[PDB]
Amino acid sequence: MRKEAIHHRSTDNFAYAYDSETLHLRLQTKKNDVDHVELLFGDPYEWHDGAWQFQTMPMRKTGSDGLFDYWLAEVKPPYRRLRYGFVLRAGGEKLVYTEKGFYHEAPSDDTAYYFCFPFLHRVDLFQAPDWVKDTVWYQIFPERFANGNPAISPKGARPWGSEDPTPTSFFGGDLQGIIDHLDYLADLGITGIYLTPIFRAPSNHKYDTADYFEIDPHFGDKETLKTLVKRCHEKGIRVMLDAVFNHCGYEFAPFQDVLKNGAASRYKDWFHIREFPLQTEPRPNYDTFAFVPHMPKLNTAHPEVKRYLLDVATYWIREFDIDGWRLDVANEIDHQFWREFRQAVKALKPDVYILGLIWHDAMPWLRGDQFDAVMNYPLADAALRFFAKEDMSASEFADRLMHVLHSYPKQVNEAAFNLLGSHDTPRLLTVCGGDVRKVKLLFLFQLTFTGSPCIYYGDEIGMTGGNDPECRKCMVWDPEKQNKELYEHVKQLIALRKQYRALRRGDVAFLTADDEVNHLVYAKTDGNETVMIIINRSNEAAEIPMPIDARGKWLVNLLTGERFAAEAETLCVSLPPYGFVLYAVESW
């Protein structure tokens, strides 16, 4: 029984509080290295006969990547506090893993041997807005969406052409447009929209922001905005704006003032500047986004900058009653700042969803003191890799997913922002090579996977385009020109997720086979509710055997409707090329 692979710490994804009463303890072991494993536990002060009184329940296997197996244990400390150790019987061997080491028998003279989860506090608890767990997001890069009132800038008219429209010049979008095609959304079934930056700024993309307190005229005015939110909410649609706090635009008052005066400027400390005769020759002598001079890094550490932002952050939550902030390049800001940020925001509107943009691992932020969630990129990479480019197998895929899933605490996932693409990556279609078939499978997986899914304005009606700035083509409002089949597909799937909690709140369970390198089958569960998903990611007709739960009564096809009685041990499911099917199991 290899020990180099047995691991647990009482922190982050291994030990945490799920709710204000239940603790979650995850243990890591090698793949099939250990048969069973029990959670040995008890309240830290429950002593008797000079020996620590303790009881022991058993942990279940909740999945495994390509190396480890993961064990979960759900427990409620009688007296809000607990000490704990692990007991793993693998074959004839029997170990007891403790913070102090491995012992052939459970020490009982002292608690010191065991890991400890002090007090389960409700305040330290991690709780993200319960609603995002049920919404379906739709991102709409304002500029290229719909032209309502022509309070637009002077240049190019809708659809430059069939291919390649878009260099780095405007088409004239605007908030009004969104308000107008607001019926479209409500029909597609979405419940939340996320607008990319919209504050007074020089580009078609509002990231090189100029004034955070003013909405870009080319988009609208306070009136226009509060109306968009009114209509939205009115229909049950939430709104999340884009918070660009890591850096500011070149036209930002204070930064401009820094050149007007140099070392003199009353705003030097608002940025990070080394050399003062600001020269951008080889490259900026001050910290800028990547190396983009026209985008200097703010100084979230400075006292003022902090209050400038903090006010902004709250300004819109109070002035327009928005529903959340997409924090841009969030990972490049001091956690302290985010701590104050969350406090300011959450003190005004608890329900404000605080989504951050972090590409890599985000444990450091999702401790419950900073972000509500983060863009689940590691997931996207996988989905595309599997369905689009067909690089990894179904198991490799299943593995990569199990792995990420287990690197955060349970609830951290339930609020994750799962997207497949955005305004920075190649349109979902083109990445599939125009094989809509694939695109539908991507939507399926994503719309039938717990988290908080988001759709990029063009993808549902089959919009094609390469990388930036191609993914940003003007939304197609020509009935004839948009793929209604893809649209109906997403529509029904969205409404499907809408009435099958399992699909949006349950846990995944891959019944993977290291043999069916192209057959992927997983099931979502929530109490009684169980939905089975089968996918033949093959270019040939396949026959995939599906495990029918013994306890099943009925078996319904969420697509076809046909509802037949389950009966055999298994159900060989026949599917066409790149085909799929959703089955809802029963109980009686």
Ligand X SMILES: OC[C@H]1O[C@@H]2O[C@H]3[C@H](O)[C@@H](O)[C@@H](O[C@H]4[C@H](O)[C@@H](O)[C@@H](O[C@H]5[C@H](O)[C@@H](O)[C@@H](O[C@H]6[C@H](O)[C@@H](O)[C@@H](O[C@H]7[C@H](O)[C@@H](O)[C@@H](O[C@H]8[C@H](O)[C@@H](O)[C@@H](O[C@H]1[C@H](O)[C@H]2O)O[C@@H]8CO)O[C@@H]7CO)O[C@@H]6CO)O[C@@H]5CO)O[C@@H]4CO)O[C@@H]3CO
Window 398 to 417, contacts with ligand X (CB under 6 A): none
- In the complex, least distance from residue 368 CB atom to its own copies, rounded to whole angstroms: 9
3-state class (DSSP) for residue 240: strand
The answer to whether the CB of 522 falls within 8 A of the CB of 509 is yes
Q: Which stretch binds ligand X (CB under 6 A): 339-347, 395-403, 421-429, 458-466?
A: 421-429
- Residue 170 interacts with ligand X (CB under 6 A)? no
Helix-strand-coil split of the chain, %, nearest 5: 25, 25, 50
- Residue 354 interacts with ligand X (CB under 6 A)? no
* Distance, CA of 418 to CA of 382 (rounded, Å): 12
Amino acid identity at 379: L
2 binds, among its own copies, ligand X, none (CB under 5 to 8 A by kind): its own copies
- Residue 43 interacts with ligand X (CB under 6 A)? no
* Distance, CA of 563 to CA of 555 (rounded, Å): 6
Looking up tokens 């390649």, which residue turns up?
164
208 binds, among ligand X, its own copies, none (CB under 5 to 8 A by kind): ligand X
Q: How far, in whole angstroms, is CA 477 from its chain's centroid?
A: 29
Select 301 or 348, whichever has its Cβ closest to its own copies. 301
Contacts of 381 (CB under 8 A, 6+ apart): none
Select 422 or 536, whichever has its Cβ closest to ligand X. 422
Looking up tokens 């008890």, which residue turns up?
42
* Distance, CA of 332 to CA of 321 (rounded, Å): 27
529 binds, among its own copies, ligand X, none (CB under 5 to 8 A by kind): none
- In the complex, least distance from residue 49 CB atom to ligand X, rounded to whole angstroms: 10
- Residue 328 interacts with ligand X (CB under 6 A)? yes
- In the complex, least distance from residue 24 CB atom to ligand X, rounded to whole angstroms: 22
Residues that bind its own copies (CB under 8 A): 2-5, 7, 9-11, 30, 44-45, 66-68, 79-81, 99-101, 112, 114-116, 118-119, 121-124, 287, 290-291, 301, 331-336, 339, 358-361, 363-364, 369, 377-378, 381, 400
251 binds, among ligand X, its own copies, none (CB under 5 to 8 A by kind): none
- Residue 289 interacts with ligand X (CB under 6 A)? yes
Select 123 or 157, whichever has its Cβ closest to its own copies. 123
- Residue 111 interacts with ligand X (CB under 6 A)? yes
- In the complex, least distance from residue 488 CB atom to ligand X, rounded to whole angstroms: 30
258 binds, among its own copies, ligand X, none (CB under 5 to 8 A by kind): none
- Residue 157 interacts with ligand X (CB under 6 A)? no
* Distance, CA of 120 to CA of 445 (rounded, Å): 36
207 binds, among ligand X, its own copies, none (CB under 5 to 8 A by kind): ligand X
Work out whether the CA dihedral 169, 172, 173, 175 comes out positive or negative.
positive
- Of 374, 383, 413, 406, the C-alpha closest to 66 is 406
- Residue 45 interacts with ligand X (CB under 6 A)? yes
- Of 321, 324, 317, 318, the C-alpha closest to 454 is 324
- In the complex, least distance from residue 359 CB atom to ligand X, rounded to whole angstroms: 4
- In the complex, least distance from residue 408 CB atom to its own copies, rounded to whole angstroms: 12
Residue 286 is encoded by which pair of tokens?
């001050």
Select 326 or 400, whichever has its Cβ closest to its own copies. 400
Q: At what angle do helices 484-498 and 436-447 cross, to 10 degrees?
A: 10
Select 171 or 207, whichever has its Cβ closest to its own copies. 207
- In the complex, least distance from residue 552 CB atom to ligand X, rounded to whole angstroms: 42
Q: How far, in whole angstroms, is CA 218 from its chain's centroid?
A: 31
3-state class (DSSP) for residue 2: coil
* Distance, CA of 191 to CA of 193 (rounded, Å): 7
205 binds, among its own copies, ligand X, none (CB under 5 to 8 A by kind): ligand X
- In the complex, least distance from residue 425 CB atom to its own copies, rounded to whole angstroms: 11
- In the complex, least distance from residue 64 CB atom to its own copies, rounded to whole angstroms: 12
363 binds, among its own copies, ligand X, none (CB under 5 to 8 A by kind): its own copies
- In the complex, least distance from residue 327 CB atom to ligand X, rounded to whole angstroms: 11
Distances from the Cα of 448 to the Cαs of 134, 197, 275, 452, 546, in angstroms? 12, 29, 53, 10, 18
Distances from the Cα of 272 to the Cαs of 247, 285, 290, 313, in angstroms? 11, 9, 14, 22
Looking up tokens 């924090």, which residue turns up?
327
Strand pairing class (74-75; 23-25): antiparallel
Distances from the Cα of 250 to the Cαs of 295, 448, 557, in angstroms? 6, 43, 56
Asked if residue 469 has a cis previous peptide bond (ω within 30° of 0), the answer is yes
Residues 455-484 vs ligand X: string with x where CB under 6 A? Answer: -------------x----------------
Q: Which stretch binds ligand X (CB under 6 A): 34-42, 106-114, 385-393, 435-443?
A: 106-114
295 φ/ψ angles, rounded to the nearest 5 degrees: -155, 85
Residues that bind ligand X (CB under 6 A): 44-45, 47, 50, 110-112, 205, 207-208, 289-292, 295, 328-329, 357, 359, 422-424, 468
